[PDB]
Subunit: 277 residues, 4 copies
Amino acid sequence: AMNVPFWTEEHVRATLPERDAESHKGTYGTALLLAGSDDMPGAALLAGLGAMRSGLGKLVIGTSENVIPLIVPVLPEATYWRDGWKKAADAQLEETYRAIAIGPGLPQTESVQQAVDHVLTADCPVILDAGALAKRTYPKREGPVILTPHPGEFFRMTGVPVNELQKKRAEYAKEWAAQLQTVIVLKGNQTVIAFPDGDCWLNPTGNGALAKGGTGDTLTGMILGMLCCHEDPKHAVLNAVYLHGACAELWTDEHSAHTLLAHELSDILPRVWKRFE
Amino acid sequence: AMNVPFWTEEHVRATLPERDAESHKGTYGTALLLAGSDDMPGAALLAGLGAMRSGLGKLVIGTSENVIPLIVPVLPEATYWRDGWKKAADAQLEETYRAIAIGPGLPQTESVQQAVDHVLTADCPVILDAGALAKRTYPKREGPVILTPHPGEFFRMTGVPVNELQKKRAEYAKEWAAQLQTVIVLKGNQTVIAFPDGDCWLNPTGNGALAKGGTGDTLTGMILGMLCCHEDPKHAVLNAVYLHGACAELWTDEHSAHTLLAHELSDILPRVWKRFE
Amino acid sequence: AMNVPFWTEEHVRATLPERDAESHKGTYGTALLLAGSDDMPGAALLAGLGAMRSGLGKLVIGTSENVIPLIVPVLPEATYWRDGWKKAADAQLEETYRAIAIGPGLPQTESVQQAVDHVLTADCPVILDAGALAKRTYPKREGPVILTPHPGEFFRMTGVPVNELQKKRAEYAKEWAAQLQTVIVLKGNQTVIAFPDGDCWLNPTGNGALAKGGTGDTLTGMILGMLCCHEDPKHAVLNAVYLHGACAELWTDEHSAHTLLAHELSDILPRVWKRFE
Amino acid sequence: AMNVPFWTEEHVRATLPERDAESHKGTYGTALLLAGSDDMPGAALLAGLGAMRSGLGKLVIGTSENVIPLIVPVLPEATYWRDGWKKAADAQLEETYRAIAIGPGLPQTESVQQAVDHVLTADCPVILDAGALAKRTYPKREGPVILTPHPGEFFRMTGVPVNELQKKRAEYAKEWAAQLQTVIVLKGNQTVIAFPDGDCWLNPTGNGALAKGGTGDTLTGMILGMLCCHEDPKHAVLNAVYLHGACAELWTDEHSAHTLLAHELSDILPRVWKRFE
Ligand SMILES: [Mg+2]
Ligand SMILES: [Mg+2]
Ligand SMILES: [Mg+2]
Ligand SMILES: [Mg+2]
């Protein structure tokens, strides 16, 4: 209705970064992932895998102490900030991170919002997902704030009912990205990527294989990693959403759309990303 | 002897659901799996994997607290109800589920039957397996109750000795499905799927690769997921049994029937299901 | 020197069992594996995987309590006897098993020999490996006792020094199998399988990829499973040793012999066994 | 600038060892890996996998007690020295090892240096990495000491700033290998392998896929294993560095360089090593 353009293959190809011979892991930065609670532990593994697959140099996972042992055997490349999402409620971040994500597998509590307030004082891009998504405003800061709501979370954030939202997804996403001065990745078929400067795109990739628990956690991780290897954070977000969807399309070539598990998106990404190089 | 028809490839093809572009995980529902105990933990992983592979939107696993960490690294897409099968002995279910399964890896105790009585007060289809199978009757309710006994469990449920049962499997399955007003999936070579309205089918797929611990737990999970993505729960049961067997047949093309592990059925399902689309 | 015959492909093909359509897991029996200690936990996973891959119907692992959680995510098809190898020091076995193995990952202690004495009172074939191997004699019983020493363990058992043993491996293996009235699988290149009735064979398969920790634990498990699906326990032992070696040969077709991990033998077995059907 | 030669394919082919038919795991020795702490557990899994993949006979991992359970399900072939890196601060090594590595995932503390002093009293080659790298000297002993610093660790060791180091990498590596009488593997694009007798080579393999956390831990493990199967420890180091890089090059044939996880290098090595045989 607003003729929002698709972020196409051509755009992805033109903007994906090189990983040059003369680089070291510092070139690609350290990401912080604040995710996973004793009650919802898997989200940290999913987002962790997505992040480390997506071109960062190092990952620190600030998860609950009891979640750490669940990640290690699957993602032994990650390091930890023990009870980090909880500690961030109380402490300013001491360390410098290339990018931060908070919220997958975290409860919708006031302490999580305290952590969010502290995350927002760093200079880097920050992603808020899942339990970090609330009805609130955001402080003026340097780096972008990227919100990743599904339609129900968008309702929690705005009071726009899901049935109204779905009739005018790009119009609402654009309006609220402007009002909040945040990026909004409004999930669903034809995910909307709305920027606070008024740019907006639709994602052309993906299918119903994604309509299952965990695929959003994987996407948050993918955005986090891509923020570390792209110079332009806008391109990071757009490429992450695109490639995430593309992985589901590769899956359905030889596998039923009913049968995908989110972690497999991460396993598919290496070959899918190669195709766009 | 009763000329029970086979649920054939043609029937599977005609009844498997589409996963359309405009869907979200809510379309495909949340399943509850009440399974796995400290003493028999693996059943929860097997049934969990089968369920999430089989087209549901979300899975909540109500397992023993000490089992949770064993599932997470393999199935990070699942969420949990801590000690859920035990809590269900005491509590009415508060939440609405698309479908429920109870029993894999659970002991044959009175408290498990208390949990079963509570599960039966929800409106959705319910599967009872393994330790949830007992000599008992069932209350009139909306959704179907699906019992998944092997011949020894059928003896526990009915007093029909296994040696007599095996001479007349479909006749006994049909008779007892009618008497109990439950679906009965009577396992074995040529698994019988008997409905309480008198419909009955045989399953034409599978082989002796299935004759090993865990393959029934996988099947319970597969039924659970398929109940979430099929509109007709009868077709869900029949397709789950069929596809489960078909996975074992794909296995034996290049692998010895002596060497299958149940979890691999779940790993095979994505490609097998595609073939029937 | 004694012209001991090789157990050849032809012999394997003629003796491997069918897994027929009309079977159930009971047909193929329940095995008990008494293995794995807090100090040497991996042996239980390796032997467990080998056993469940090798045609049994059910596996009960009697391992240390703290080892159980390490097995479940890899082998969720196994069930447990908590602290079973320790409990067997004190208790007669109550249950009937198709076959039993004891010793992988267990210490060389008197309590382990107490467990061995109790295992030997069951009627089934029994395998003794690793910490269960000691200088001792064996009581007259029905089923065979199968000892699986490497040359150093054979020295512990007999006082034959390794340097003398290695000059006359089949002569010593045959002599001691007769003296002890046990089967002796004397490991190494050209593994000797010596029976107490005087039959003896050499194994023609395998290579130096096997010369690394864990491959013997895998073999013990393979013998355990094959004892469950072969009518003739002699053929079970001989086929297990043969197929174990054959898996290492398949590996080295496209992978360096320096790089095999024991668990991969179990992963290779499905395709290797198919070739001999 | 100093015309340092590359360690080429031809050199690798001429020096890689055979794994002969008549070998046993003792032929290839027992390695000790002192790695992994509660705070940095993954390094032990990465280095463990690299070591066991690289032609040793047995591996003992002296890791923190709470790390052990994280390794077992992935590497069940390893055995353990519980809290071994900590115990080595206090105890002379009692056992004889073919080679030792210390430091991946260990903190930069005085107690770790105490452990290093004890490790250095064994006769075998020893690798120091990560937290074991400090500004210090080394005692005259038989076997080589192999330091594996990245440029920041080289600064910690020498006071040569990273920006100066990077202009003259081979000159600084050679100078400091001579001064310390240690091997120095100075990591980065064109890794420098400097020997204390003045030999020095550059590594021609690898790419930016390696520029991510964990790949150095994998390399330490690879050196450790190769020290066990090569007669000449110089060739072990050079081949480990070469093959590690070659694995990343194989990866990038069909996968994006941004998406490699360190553990996959270990999974690739079997096929890559075969190519050089
Ligand atoms: Mg989400
Ligand atoms: Mg069952
Ligand atoms: Mg052994
Ligand atoms: Mg390092």
